[PDB]
């Protein structure tokens, strides 16, 4: 089930069996990598790069055309973000609740959800620190985090 | 349910050692409070001095007068009550008479219809009370 909800909802994607590139896709591996280089210059995270390529170019999976995941392509050229995108969005969410909680401090529900969101931050930074993605001295301070996102 | 994993021996051994205290036979044989409270002090028998002949009324529906003696022990000075088992064996005992008492069957619990009495007299002035009863010996 869900990590901090009592939801058991299934609802995910389902990749097809054959991982061969379709014949109607007349688009080489370099022309996709150059395409990914420009979309990442516009500040797009690798999740929403694959949405653009799927919806407008017929590239259902980048790693079947090019052989590489999108984040491996960006790290090979220096277009990678410093924080991972999923950690970035948990920190960006924890700022908007804590800014909301400055003014609405009787909102005990938001105080509860901020504990759940920040518990996910520390479970997620534990993972990227043992995989040597973040430096080992990296802490999450609530008072300094607002400058890191947006 | 219970943890089954291969490294859970400490969780299982310590949980067991804590849950042993919740039954009566382990608790009284390992606190030492009940060992402090019986007047035998962990022994099977004790010699005492008869202070007084006392009559104890039987618990209902029984309606008799159970003949007992009020005995002060020699070992530790604790005063107890001991039953005198047989038809008319109170007449063999006097006061200031040195008896031997034993337990009465239920390992410290009260027995039968005698309230609050858990001992019985065995020997009366170094002579067994079963021999005074059957006429084997004399005072």
């Amino acid at each position: 089930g869900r990590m901090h909800a009592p939801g058991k909802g299934l609802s995910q994607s389902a990749l097809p069996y054959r991982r061969s590139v379709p014949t109607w896709l007349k688009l080489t591996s370099d022309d996709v990598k150059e395409q990914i280089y420009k979309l990442a210059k516009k500040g797009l995270t690798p999740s929403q790069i694959g949405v653009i390529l799927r919806d407008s170019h017929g590239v259902a999976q980048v790693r079947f055309v090019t052989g590489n995941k999108i984040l491996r392509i960006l790290k090979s050229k220096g277009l990678a973000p410093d924080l991972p995108e999923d950690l970035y969005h948990l920190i960006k969410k924890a700022v908007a609740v804590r800014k909301h909680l400055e003014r609405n401090r009787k909102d005990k529900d938001a105080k509860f959800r901020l504990i759940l969101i920040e518990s996910r931050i520390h479970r997620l930074a534990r993972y990227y620190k043992t995989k040597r993605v973040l430096p080992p001295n990296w802490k999450y301070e609530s008072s300094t985090a607002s400058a890191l996102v947006a | 349910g219970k943890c089954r994993g291969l490294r859970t021996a400490r969780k299982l051994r310590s949980h067991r050692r804590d849950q042993k205290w919740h039954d009566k036979q382990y608790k009284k044989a390992h606190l030492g409070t009940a060992l402090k409270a019986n007047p035998f002090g962990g022994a099977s028998h004790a010699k005492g001095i008869v202070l007084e002949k006392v009559g104890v009324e039987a618990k209902q529906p029984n309606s008799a007068i159970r003949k007992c003696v009020r005995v002060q022990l020699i070992k530790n000075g604790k005063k107890i009550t001991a039953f005198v088992p047989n038809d008319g064996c109170l007449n063999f005992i006097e006061e200031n008479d040195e008896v031997l008492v034993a337990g009465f069957g239920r390992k410290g619990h009260a027995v039968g219809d005698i309230p609050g009495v858990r001992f019985k007299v065995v020997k009366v002035a170094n002579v067994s009370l079963l021999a005074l009863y059957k006429g084997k010996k004399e005072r």
């Binding site: 069996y17 991982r19 | 994993g5």
Partner: protein, 129 residues
Amino acid sequence: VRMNVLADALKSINNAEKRGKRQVLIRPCSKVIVRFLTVMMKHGYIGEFEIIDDHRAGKIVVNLTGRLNKCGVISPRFDVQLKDLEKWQNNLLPSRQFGFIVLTTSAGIMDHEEARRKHTGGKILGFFF
């Protein structure tokens, strides 16, 4: 969550056996299950089983003959020496005449009669009879 794939495989074979069904899906296929079913199949309790490959942990369709009483797993996989094996025999098996304790020894996944012949111990996976 799912900690043990072999347990969910054998519980689903056991439930479909007493419902009297002929076939049963076994979700994720590991290679330990496949080596477990062959030991059940060489001694003849199950029919031929089809393994389905779907580019992840696959599925197995198993034909049931109607012969199985109880396929069980043992958790954890206790290490078993040959000294202690006969004490597992009269705790798991209904008789000394039939039934098998499945071991995983260094020479492969074996039933208990084969491990006496090969003179080796191993960890216990489960049993069936």
